[PDB]
Structures are given as C-alpha cells and as structure tokens.
Amino acid sequence: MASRILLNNGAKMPILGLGTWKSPPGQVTEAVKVAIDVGYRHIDCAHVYQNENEVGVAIQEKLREQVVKREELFIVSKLWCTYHEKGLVKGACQKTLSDLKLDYLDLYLIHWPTGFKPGKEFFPLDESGNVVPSDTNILDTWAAMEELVDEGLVKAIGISNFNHLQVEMILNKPGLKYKPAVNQIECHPYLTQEKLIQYCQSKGIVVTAYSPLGSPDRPWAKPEDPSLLEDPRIKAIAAKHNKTTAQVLIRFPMQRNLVVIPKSVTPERIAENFKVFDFELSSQDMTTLLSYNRNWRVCALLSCTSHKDYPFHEEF
C-alpha cells in the first residue's frame, strides 16, 4: 500500500502522521525529532494544544540539519473555536505559522464546527458552565479559510468533527470556491464511523482518523471505560500477525483508505507505530474489527452540547 493519499487540491498527504495533543512541551521537541528520523513526514498540530512552539523547534532543526526538505513534510494545524470570526482567522493562522516556524501549512482545519466568544480563554463559559457561542456560522468561517489558500498561507483547507449535515452544508455553500480536502474525525474499532466515512469518501473528501488507539491518556478517562489496547480480541489479531495491538489499530484505518495520526512521546512507540507498511490485515480481520463498534467517543464535551452547531446530536 502506497504511503500517501491524493487530496482534492492535487497534493499528496502521508497516510501516517504523528499526533501531538497532550505531548508535554518538554518532551514534544524530541518526539518530533525522533519521528522525523524514523520516517514520519506528517505531524498533526493545533494551537489549542499549547505546544506548537516546541513542535516547531523540532521541525526547524530537522530542516536545518537537512534530514528532510520542507516539500517532503506535511504539517497540519487547526483553527481554534474562539477564532471563527472573519477578522481573526488570518491572525490565528499566522500565530500557528510563527510558532511552527513555517511559511505555509500543508493543511489547515476548522478544529470544531462551533464558534465560541473570542478572548483569552479557549473555553469561555457562562456562570452555569455552558460554553459562550459566537454568532459565526460554518459557511462564513469557510470563506475565511478559502482566503488563506488565496493568500498562500496554507496549501489545503479542511474540517474536523463535522457531521454529515455540516459537511453537506459546506459542499452546498453558495459560491463555494474550494471543497474541504479532509474531515478529521474520531475513528477506531469502538467508533467505526461507517456512515460518515462513506459519505465523505463519496464526495472526494479524505478522512483522517484521530484517537486511533482510543486516547488512553485523555484527561477525562475513567478507570471503567473500554480499552482498545487491552481488548483481548484485538490482541488476538495482533498475535496472529506477529504485530502489537497498537500496530493493528494503526493498520486498520490505513486499509479503509483513511489517514491516521497516533500520538506518542515515547521514542520506542513512535518507531513501533511507524512499522505498519509491511503487513496486511485480511478482509475477515477488517470486518471483525469493524464488528467491535459500540458508538463510544473519546471526544465529546458536555459544556458544548447546547451550542447550535454541536456535532454529536445527529446520528452521523
């Protein structure tokens, strides 16, 4: 299987990337350096992760070392919810570019479909704990994203955590100039996303699977939640293939024509997670993994559930 997938902007995107949410700032520079050394060419970032400066130090060092050329890297970031307004989008993108020490992004995503009140706080709340919306809509935010392409700041634009109706809304936008290249969504054997993936793929939008290992380090994890990495059924498939459970969990989305972005700051795991291009899951393995769906989400948030554009009320 090829290492890159063709996007609808004509560029190629590496199907395996390194995630950086929760990667501590004192560890992520080394994580990204190791990742590039062992073959990663795609890094998934976001302003809200609060570590783009440190990710950027690694990228810049490897460019300076001539370990890789800029054209060989595929750097992704995301517009945070408090920057959905017309007059804030460019500055938000530029702050990310400055922190990453880049002059363009390969892909810039609307991080969530919901706009929040601008200000210092990433999650502005009312006194009862509800997020404070902005009156921005996804269509006007999309127009602002299109401007970034036309200014040379980003090579591709896309969306993240958009449900099928929200994706449709963008595709049906009056005067749409650039289609979204990517929809980045949670996807793993407990949240298999067949419906949304089929819709996006049918429209030529590439899907990136986040939290492919079930995000065991998510800060809201409870001791009782289901655990992909410990599921004996998945362990059995891994054993049959002489691979680790994580390697199976990474290979799974790859064979569905998805991009996948496992996170690690552990050098041995960063390397392990990349060793997924030399085995194949059978069709029976794939269907068996799909059968584990339970509609379980890592990534949901009670404080945002009343926002008009909260994505997870819809079935898909």
Ligand SMILES: NC(=O)c1ccc[n+]([C@@H]2O[C@H](COP(=O)([O-])OP(=O)(O)OC[C@H]3O[C@@H](n4cnc5c(N)ncnc54)[C@H](OP(=O)(O)O)[C@@H]3O)[C@@H](O)[C@H]2O)c1
């Ligand atoms: N667009 C969005 O809204 C959104 C939401 C969630 C995630 N994302 C992106 O997707 C990335 C991945 O998702 P995620 O960070 O939620 O979780 P994940 O990649 O599913 O899991 C990360 C966890 O798995 C551990 N791990 C990694 N490789 C392992 C291995 N080979 N064996 C055992 N454990 C392993 C990591 O530990 P160590 O790091 O300690 O090694 C970490 O605790 C994020 O970092 C972010 O870039 C985007």
Ligand SMILES: O=C(O)COc1cc(Cl)ccc1C(=O)NCc1c(F)c(F)c(Br)c(F)c1F
């Ligand atoms: O969003 C990510 O990439 C990973 O998760 C996070 C990362 C950071 Cl640094 C802070 C918070 C989160 C988190 O609570 N995510 C869930 C989450 C939602 F479910 C949602 F519906 C809306 Br809207 C959100 F804004 C939102 F944040």
